[PDB]
């Protein structure tokens, strides 16, 4: 019954910045994870709350596919109960995650010479991020007790910082494309399971 449009997500020309991670709903299809391989050297595929070996014998009300890019040393922060700049400011995952993540290197395709400024991450925030929340405001974040009336300068920095991806970066510093599939199931008809 039709194949899930995983190409439109994994083969997408450009991935959104981590601070503005996309969200594509996938439903009314069959999840054929077999074809997912042979697409770049994947760096991480670990699942919580569901045994991958049986993934083809169950399906859910829907699944949300959130795609973004982060540096390798940072990918470990995409997990329930984790802490870090991404975990508290850009992308926060609930402790009861019913789903899992996929990460693959994209240095050859997403690391411009001299620095790729197309990707930004939120380095400052007043408070942590609630699970599955999106923040895009670029208001000047004051750090000290001196209000700056929204002017960049001393003790008042721009919240977003552009990733400086370069070919000569470290082994773990190169960009990594991450796609998180959150399986949401309720008392509703199931939508996305592969061959039995």
């Amino acid at each position: 019954t039709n194949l899930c449009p995983f190409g439109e997500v994994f083969n997408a020309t450009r991935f959104a910045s981590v601070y503005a991670w996309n969200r594509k709903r996938i439903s009314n299809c069959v999840a054929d994870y077999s074809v997912l391989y042979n697409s770049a050297s994947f760096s991480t595929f670990k699942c919580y709350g569901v045994s991958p070996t049986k993934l083809n014998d169950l399906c859910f009300t829907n699944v949300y596919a959130d795609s973004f890019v982060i540096r390798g040393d940072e990918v470990r922060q995409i997990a329930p109960g984790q802490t870090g700049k991404i975990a508290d400011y850009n992308y926060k995952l609930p402790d009861d995650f019913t789903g899992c993540v996929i990460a693959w290197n994209s240095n050859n395709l997403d690391s411009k010479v001299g620095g790729n400024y197309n990707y930004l991450y939120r380095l400052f925030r007043k408070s942590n991020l609630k699970p599955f929340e999106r923040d895009i405001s670029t208001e000047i974040y004051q750090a000290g007790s001196t209000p700056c009336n929204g002017v960049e300068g001393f003790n008042c920095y721009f919240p977003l910082q552009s990733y400086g991806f370069q070919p000569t970066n470290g082994v773990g510093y190169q960009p990594y494309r991450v796609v998180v599939l959150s399986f949401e199931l309720l008392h509703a008809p199931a939508t996305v399971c592969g061959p039995k």
Partner: antibody
Framework: QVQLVESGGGVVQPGRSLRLSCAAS????????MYWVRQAPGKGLEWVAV????????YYADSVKGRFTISRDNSKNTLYLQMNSLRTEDTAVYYC?????????????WGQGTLVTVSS | ALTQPASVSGSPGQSITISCTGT?????????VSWYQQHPGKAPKLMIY???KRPSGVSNRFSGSKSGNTASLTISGLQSEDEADYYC??????????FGGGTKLTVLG
Amino acid sequence: QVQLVESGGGVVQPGRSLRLSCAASGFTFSNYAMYWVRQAPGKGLEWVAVISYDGSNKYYADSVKGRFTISRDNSKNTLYLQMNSLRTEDTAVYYCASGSDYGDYLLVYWGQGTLVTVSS
Amino acid sequence: ALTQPASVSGSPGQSITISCTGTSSDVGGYNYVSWYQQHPGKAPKLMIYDVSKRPSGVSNRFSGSKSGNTASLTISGLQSEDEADYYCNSLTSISTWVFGGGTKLTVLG
């Protein structure tokens, strides 16, 4: 297919200005970093210059540091290299490489390239 | 720069290996080498993408490999039409795109 055409330039006197233009088509210019690579007649290749995908950052080979200037414009889809204070040893054929998808640290397309002769 | 053999010769059919070496910074630490084949009076075009890979449309026979500090290209069953110059590239620190130098293949015709 993707085309890259160099404006070129005839024999010029040593220590004189010269502007070379590389026009590209068939692919998105404004998302990749061009390179200028010279080849002396009968010798091997030698990287000359590279410019970032937006012109913010430019790198030159030590041999041409402080004499060349590589720029680009995306409005008309073109790349420019300005040569000042030429030297006789600089005569060579210049190639305008692209660094297309799946690699930007490497040169891929290698357009036809023009010839520049520096003789008095 | 990099060091390469001045010239390599071999009859058609067998395997031919061309090796280029550099300091740790050029290829010893960075695995970004890529080899180009330039025919006489022609624009060089990529042959070996990355340390060991090949862009779509090129011949399967060519194969890149890396042994520690050295990078090698292996050609299986080369024909007469493979007579051309071959250069090994490398991305070093602080940019500085070094080049292999010169290497010519000939067929015992």
